[PDB]
Amino acid sequence: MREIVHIQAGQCGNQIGAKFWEVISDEHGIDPSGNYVGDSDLQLERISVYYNEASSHKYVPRAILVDLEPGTMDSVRSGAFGHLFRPDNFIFGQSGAGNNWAKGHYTEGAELVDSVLDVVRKECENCDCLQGFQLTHSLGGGTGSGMGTLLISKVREEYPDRIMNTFSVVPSPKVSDTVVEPYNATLSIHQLVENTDETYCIDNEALYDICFRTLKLATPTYGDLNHLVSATMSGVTTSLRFPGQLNADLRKLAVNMVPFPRLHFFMPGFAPLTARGSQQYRALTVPELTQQMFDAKNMMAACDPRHGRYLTVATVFRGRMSMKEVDEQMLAIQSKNSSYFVEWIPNNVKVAVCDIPPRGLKMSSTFIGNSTAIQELFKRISEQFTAMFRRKAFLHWYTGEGMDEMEFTEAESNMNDLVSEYQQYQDATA
Amino acid sequence: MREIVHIQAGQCGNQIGAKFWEVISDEHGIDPSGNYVGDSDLQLERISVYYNEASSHKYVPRAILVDLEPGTMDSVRSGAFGHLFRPDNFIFGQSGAGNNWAKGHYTEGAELVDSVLDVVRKECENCDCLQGFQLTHSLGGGTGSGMGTLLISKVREEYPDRIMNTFSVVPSPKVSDTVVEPYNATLSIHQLVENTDETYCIDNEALYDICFRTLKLATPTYGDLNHLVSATMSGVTTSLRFPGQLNADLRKLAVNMVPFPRLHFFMPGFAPLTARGSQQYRALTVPELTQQMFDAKNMMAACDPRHGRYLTVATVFRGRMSMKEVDEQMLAIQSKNSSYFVEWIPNNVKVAVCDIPPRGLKMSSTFIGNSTAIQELFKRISEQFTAMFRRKAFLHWYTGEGMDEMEFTEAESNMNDLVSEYQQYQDATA
Amino acid sequence: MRECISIHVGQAGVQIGNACWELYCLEHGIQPDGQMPDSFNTFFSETGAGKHVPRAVFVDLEPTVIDEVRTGTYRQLFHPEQLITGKEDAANNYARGHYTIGKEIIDLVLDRIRKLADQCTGLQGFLVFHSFGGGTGSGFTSLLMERLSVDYGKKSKLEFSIYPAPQVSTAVVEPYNSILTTHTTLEHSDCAFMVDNEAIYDICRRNLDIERPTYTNLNRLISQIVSSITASLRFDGALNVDLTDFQTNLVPYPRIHFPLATYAPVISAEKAYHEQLSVAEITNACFEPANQMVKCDPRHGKYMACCLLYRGDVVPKDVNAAIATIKTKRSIQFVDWCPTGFKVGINYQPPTVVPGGDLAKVQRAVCMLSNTTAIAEAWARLDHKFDLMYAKRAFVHWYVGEGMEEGEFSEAREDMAALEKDYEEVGVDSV
Amino acid sequence: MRECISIHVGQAGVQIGNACWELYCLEHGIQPDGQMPDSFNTFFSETGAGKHVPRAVFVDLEPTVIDEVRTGTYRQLFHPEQLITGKEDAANNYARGHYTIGKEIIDLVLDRIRKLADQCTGLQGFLVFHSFGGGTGSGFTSLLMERLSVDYGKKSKLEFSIYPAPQVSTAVVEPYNSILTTHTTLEHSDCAFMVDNEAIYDICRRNLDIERPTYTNLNRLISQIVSSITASLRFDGALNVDLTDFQTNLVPYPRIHFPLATYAPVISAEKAYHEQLSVAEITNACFEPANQMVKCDPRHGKYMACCLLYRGDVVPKDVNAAIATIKTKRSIQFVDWCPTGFKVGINYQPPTVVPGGDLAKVQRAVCMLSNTTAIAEAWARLDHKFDLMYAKRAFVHWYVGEGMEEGEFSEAREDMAALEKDYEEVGVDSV
Ligand SMILES: Nc1nc2c(ncn2[C@@H]2O[C@H](COP(=O)(O)OP(=O)(O)OP(=O)(O)O)[C@@H](O)[C@H]2O)c(=O)[nH]1
Ligand SMILES: Nc1nc2c(ncn2[C@@H]2O[C@H](COP(=O)(O)OP(=O)(O)OP(=O)(O)O)[C@@H](O)[C@H]2O)c(=O)[nH]1
Ligand SMILES: Nc1nc2c(ncn2[C@@H]2O[C@H](COP(=O)(O)OP(=O)(O)O)[C@@H](O)[C@H]2O)c(=O)[nH]1
Ligand SMILES: Nc1nc2c(ncn2[C@@H]2O[C@H](COP(=O)(O)OP(=O)(O)O)[C@@H](O)[C@H]2O)c(=O)[nH]1
Ligand SMILES: [Mg+2]
Ligand SMILES: [Mg+2]
């Protein structure tokens, strides 16, 4: 009854969304044809959160697929679970943003946003009690970044009281996949800080580290990274979707990890994350899940939590487990790492527990951390931005698309304010 | 002909009254169904004292059962000798006093007192020559204390000359069964001193001491204490119902035990109390009965008669005995303990003798003592009262129910005057 | 006759009511479908054909926890209209559960409670189960208590709340909700029996030898406490204790009304076989600081009043001897103005063992509800946490955006400071 | 032709009358049903069909004691209208029996006495049995004597009262009742024969070897004394004594009219066989202080007058020799103003043994009635007791609440002081 509208923008967003819907359909027993082939009755007891029941009892994901080029739409359509999405929900252009934020936010994105918004309005009206929105996109690109930011702004204008979550793939620290990455990332964050309630910053390099050193994958592919991202997304929405001992929906986590409106950038992580080479050795217990979750190596963003302080943490456990053990592990973690949690928020951890574990597992958990170490990321991007803005490199593209350099200065100032706030609350004392 | 109207208030009153009616029925040979199945003619000679004859030669106890909750009424009705009582005589409320004197005396009991008085008037009209009233209740409780006090006051206003005996279970010295015991006890005594002729004070701790040290009862329930109290009541009223060599009704005992109107608080006791395993090692004779009766540890009130002087004593013997022996024993008791009897009342002992002993016994005797040692008990209560009234603890429960603190001060002053008078007459010298 | 209405609010309240009503059905022999193959009257209503409908309301602002009940084992027991659910929870937000989301469901629950009261002959009062740290448990409970006080002013209202634990915690905004709901419900509640999850976890570990207890075992123990109280109200005993008896004997002043619950014979069958759990043994175990179900050391304060509710094969003489022994103990200290600080209740019905539970079948049991100044310390700690956040105004925007003002935060903190001052004054010697 | 009417008041009087009338029925051969299978004429009236009805009135303010008679072995003897009962006793309160309860029954008893006296051709007088220390015995008796002094002012009225024992007492208000009734009847009574229960207990122990006597034995002995007197009235003898003779011989002054009774051959059957109870021996035993039936020592005082009533095989010369021997004795002292202080009567009818009794069958008997100043001591003691209580006004409210006034207490005490002074003056030597 707590409907969530999923929006995928750009290539990264569309691929992550495809894997996400694979995972969700597996969880709810929906086969790629949209038919229910599950076993438990709990799979259908909250199917309305993510799916719409159509005539003939076929379940259509409540997803809107947005891109400015048709290649990704064609790839998603022609694949497993490709005949799952509503054909009317594929809204795409022809040209493409060209890795340009301005093109996808002012010229092409502006042209196609009206159609995207019409589809979103139809989806929201069909809903019974809308819970919020989800956006999967990447800040590095132009379609994903710029279009997702435009859609976020417009939807927030229309639905200001709903929850808006974005699983945004932030630029990596070492190697960049786009030359103009800092411009797009800065211009996107300047809008995310204002028009979003929860942003889960995901870095591809942290995911490579997880898939190489933890999962021992010789040749990790974007399929595996998208699987990890989908695992975190599904963990949160499962807190929402299945019965448990301690329930928690999107608004509960937002309330418990956003002390101030602008401090809503989180680092996610998945607990088990065990390679096959070692699946038979380690014991799956709440202490192991917690130890892995709070390990700085397991974080899905390339920011070391040891370089800052945890403003807040959320642990969404899944499976049948003792609440006593969960609380004892949380207290032990807070006591051992007393230097890594702000002293002015007693009990920096928010615990939720769900009865149904992920498919193929007996136990699992998703960790979402609101920490000041995230400032590092912004600082990094910020400096890169200046490095190019001082010389005005690649700027003529954005200016020609119809922007102004004053917009760049405003975005840089807003990012500087964000890092200043994060540092100030890191240094604040009781 | 000298009818007595029995009234039970609260849980303690109703339970003790149930046991009392079982004892009286056994004495008069009335079966639990009301039919007379006795063997002696004397049993029916004075059945009218406690029973009312009904059509079909069934005998209905002249008892009024009053409470503010239906639990005690249900427990009494569903039990042995439950059908004995008239159904119309069960008057009860639905809320309960909550161990609050104010509730049972002003708000919850005020509504029910009119109905109880109507029943009492109806029961009193069918009396050739009313002798007096009996009330069994507890001073430390709610319903019992306050409601019974209100009924006592109203009955005394309606029947100023009739005798009014109360068998009241006053708070124990060591351990309390109710946090607000001092308030209820003080407020109840403040009215008992003015609206009664005889108040037989009984302490549960003294009864526990008797049951464990004299009767050697490993597990003395409330049935046993209630049986002791019932034996005391029956012994007090025996001379009204059976013939003897020296008769004494309630008025005779009141005249012989109340030198001044306010000094009408007595300590009772039963003489033949003996363990089951010692019934063959003792001689049941008047000397043994007297020695047991005048022992401090046999007193049913937790007070030491050696800490004061006996203003008066009464001994109601039952059985075939010699008046010479009884008189000689009383003279010896008075001579030996010349210091424990006031010197300004020659012959402090009043003797009555009956012919019919309690069933299963050859001899018996009930001892009633009007002694200045009773002051100690009042003093104790007074002290506790002040300890709580100085800080006004639990007082908002009484004030909020429609009482003024001036009433509390008046009650404390009255009990202080009572202890002062008792001490004055203890110290008085010829 | 002595009808009592149970209102379960939030996930904690609903999941405790599940165990409570399982225990009641077992005690009275009522099948989970409402049929029996008049003690069952203060808590059940007979629907003509022998069906027994609980006299309770299950209210939450989200459907999940109550949709479990609507499809669980007892789906056929509760009247479907008594199970009330919203659409979006309060999200651990007091303002959402009190002002924004609670206002849309308060009328429905009040109508249902009015129906239940009309169905009753003599209403003793309400038992409100909820959680201090929850959103709907804290806010909606306060709103409901205000409305009930407006409607049923005289009727007693007792709460069974999960006081936040000193160290264990599942939410980051617990102090805000706790302080706000305490401020709102201070003048609208009679007694507030309090338990802690941390204390019950410790008890389960030490006594029941359960190393990984869950909320099910905590709920079973809490249901045993509630069963002791409502059994004093239900069955026949030597000494009967009504709800007003608690209200009168446990609350010396209108604001000092936060007792702590305690169940003495918490023991496993294997350990129980080797013990003779006499009245003295369970009574002494009641006053052991480690056996308290609220994580507060009673030795840091003075008992103001105790209510010992015995059960089963209990003799009044044994109870008196045990209480005298307790009064003799010098480590157990009472205030100077409560010379008589023991309300005693005795019931003839021994505790009922739930099939699948951890508690062993016993012949005796005592539930001790003690008002004590030790709770003051807990309050202080809670207040401290509040300050630590309110200084930075952390999370305050969430509450302000839901029809609340920072003035409410300031007023609540001042009220709790006054409560702490009252506890300090009450604990002072009368000299 | 010499009818005498017996009035039994209170429990003591009624229970003494039971024994008295059993003894009379035995003496005259009348069966308990009233049929004999003209000496009896003085006490019994023939009912035409051969039935004898006692000339007695049994009056009490409570039903129990007389209801025993109405359903006892002698239920058929007494006229049912002669057994008068009230509804509530005087409760050991003089005022209740004299002012409040007595006034409601006095008319009935006076009417019955009038009916009894109408059948009497020549009425000798009334024998009133009662107790000094009782409510109806003391108060109602005084009221009845007051009324009789008006209805039959000339007739002689003799009382058989149980004077309160010096130490043994069954009530705490005995001195009040005794003083009040003595003050009231000091002028409405002719002779008052006194007996203490304590003295009779001592006699029963010492002489009859009865270690544990009851009121039945005391009543049997008192009935033997009353017999002796009324037998001098009834049977034929050498010297005849009437009621007027007692009044004239035993009462030197109008207020000194309290003789003490004594019975010499008080002896068990086993012990009687070894003694030749000659007239001299019984006469000597009469004057032995240990044999006095009032617990006062005659050696402490002087014998104002003596009346010896012998029964059985008694020779007048033997009586004269015994009395001369007594006069010779100096242990026994007589007042100066009574040179001849011996009334003597002799009767031919020996005492009858009541079956089941304790007294032995004897051929001789003597009853002494002695007016002596030793009784003054008793009065003084009684007076002291009164003071001790009236100083504190103990129990006074009980009397004042039933029609009396403290002025009556003061007047009674003053009258008793005057009586003590009269006794002291009488005991002085004329010189
Ligand atoms: N003893 C016990 N505590 C519980 C239970 N369920 C939740 N809690 C505790 O209650 C607190 C959280 O309150 P919720 O139960 O989450 O409160 P709610 O009233 O449902 O609030 P929202 O769902 O946020 O609107 C935490 O302390 C949990 O540990 C339960 O079954 N038993
Ligand atoms: N000798 C003797 N004395 C008795 C007898 N019965 C009572 N007494 C004594 O008389 C005194 C008590 O007076 P009651 O006989 O009790 O007086 P009452 O006249 O019946 O008085 P109320 O019952 O108070 O109206 C005590 O001294 C008793 O010992 C009896 O049968 N024989
Ligand atoms: N994790 C992940 N990152 C992706 C995926 N596809 C593209 N990206 C990242 O997203 C950025 C490229 O932006 P894209 O999403 O292709 O841009 P747009 O089409 O311009 O919106 C780079 O950081 C890529 O590494 C994918 O499937 N998974
Ligand atoms: N002797 C005796 N005392 C009782 C009994 N039942 C309760 N009590 C005492 O009465 C007091 C409690 O008062 P209760 O009778 O409960 O109060 P009420 O019904 O509220 O007036 C305590 O002192 C109990 O020990 C009983 O059967 N026998
Ligand atoms: Mg919830
Ligand atoms: Mg009498």
UniProtKB/Swiss-Prot annotation, chains A, B:
Where does the chain bind GDP? 10-12, 15, 99, 138, 142-144, 177, 204, 222, 226
The terms under GO molecular function for this entry are: GTP binding; GTPase activity; metal ion binding; netrin receptor binding; peptide binding; structural constituent of cytoskeleton
Q: Name one GO biological process term.
A: axon guidance
What gene name does this entry carry?
TUBB3
**Stated role:** Tubulin is the major constituent of microtubules, protein filaments consisting of alpha- and beta-tubulin heterodimers. Microtubules grow by the addition of GTP-tubulin dimers to the microtubule end, where a stabilizing cap forms. Below the cap, alpha-beta tubulin heterodimers are in GDP-bound state, owing to GTPase activity of alpha-tubulin. TUBB3 plays a critical role in proper axon guidance and maintenance.
Binding of GTP occurs at 11, 69, 138, 142-144, 204, 226
Full protein name: Tubulin beta-3 chain
Outcome (variant: residue 178 to M): In CDCBM1; can form tubulin heterodimers that are properly incorporated into microtubules; the microtubules are less stable than wild-type
Q: Which disease does its entry mention?
A: Fibrosis of extraocular muscles, congenital, 3A: A congenital ocular motility disorder marked by restrictive ophthalmoplegia affecting extraocular muscles innervated by the oculomotor and/or trochlear nerves. It is clinically characterized by anchoring of the eyes in downward gaze, ptosis, and backward tilt of the head. Congenital fibrosis of extraocular muscles type 3 presents as a non-progressive, autosomal dominant disorder with variable expression. Cortical dysplasia, complex, with other brain malformations 1: A disorder of aberrant neuronal migration and disturbed axonal guidance. Affected individuals have mild to severe intellectual disability, strabismus, axial hypotonia, and spasticity. Brain imaging shows variable malformations of cortical development, including polymicrogyria, gyral disorganization, and fusion of the basal ganglia, as well as thin corpus callosum, hypoplastic brainstem, and dysplastic cerebellar vermis. Extraocular muscles are not involved.
The answer to keyword tRNA processing applying to this record is no
Modification sites for Phosphoserine: 172
Identify the GO cellular component terms for this protein.
axon; cell periphery; cytoplasm; dendrite; extracellular exosome; filopodium; growth cone; intercellular bridge
Q: What is the effect of changing residue 417 to H?
A: In CFEOM3A; severe phenotype with congenital facial weakness, congenital wrist and finger contractures
Q: What is the effect of changing residue 417 to N?
A: In CFEOM3A; some patients with lower extremity weakness and sensory loss in the second to third decade of life; also found in patients without CFEOM3A who developed polyneuropathy
From the Swiss-Prot or TrEMBL record, state where the protein is found: Cytoplasm, Cytoskeleton; Cell projection, Growth cone; Cell projection, Lamellipodium; Cell projection, Filopodium
From Swiss-Prot, chains C, D:
- Which positions does the record annotate as the modified residue Omega-N-methylarginine? 330
The molecular function terms in GO held by this entry are: double-stranded RNA binding; GTP binding; GTPase activity; structural constituent of cytoskeleton; structural molecule activity; ubiquitin protein ligase binding
Q: Name what cofactor the protein needs.
A: Mg(2+)
Q: What is its EC number?
A: 3.6.5.-
Ubl conjugation recorded as keyword: yes
Q: Specify the signal sequence span.
A: none
Modified sites of kind 3'-nitrotyrosine: 273
State the UniProt keywords alphabetically.
Answer: Acetylation, Cytoplasm, Cytoskeleton, GTP-binding, Hydrolase, Isopeptide bond, Methylation, Microtubule, Nitration, Nucleotide-binding, Phosphoprotein, Ubl conjugation
Q: Where does GTP bind?
A: 10-12, 15, 62, 90, 131, 134-137, 170, 174, 197, 215, 219, 243
Q: What is known of its domains?
A: The MREC motif mediates interaction with TTC5/STRAP and may be critical for tubulin autoregulation.
Protein name in the entry: Tubulin alpha-1B chain
Highest lineage ranks of the organism? Eukaryota, Metazoa, Chordata, Craniata, Vertebrata
